[PDB]
């Protein structure tokens, strides 16, 4: 019953949690 609108909001919100990891994992490996 979840509105189709909310769904893409969440997926886009979890898309940012994908970049903050990439930014972390770089800076951590770059050390």
User: Which residues of this protein are in contact with ligand CLA, per CB under 6 A?
Assistant: 10-11, 14
Tell me which of ligand CLA, another protein, none is bound by residue 6, counting a contact when its beta carbon lies within the kind-specific cut-off of 5 to 8 angstroms. Answer: another protein
- Residue number with the shortest CB distance to ligand CLA? 14
Tell me which of another protein, ligand CLA, none is bound by residue 1, counting a contact when its beta carbon lies within the kind-specific cut-off of 5 to 8 angstroms. Answer: another protein
Write the DSSP string, 1-31: ---HHHHHHHHHHHHHHHHHHHHHHHHHHH-
User: Least distance in Å: CB of 27 to ligand CLA?
Assistant: 16
The vertex-13 CA angle with 23 and 31, nearest 5°, equals: 10
């Amino acid at each position: 019953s979840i509105s189709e609108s909310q769904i893409f909001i969440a997926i886009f919100l979890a898309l940012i949690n994908g970049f903050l990891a990439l930014r972390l994992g770089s800076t951590l490996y770059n050390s």
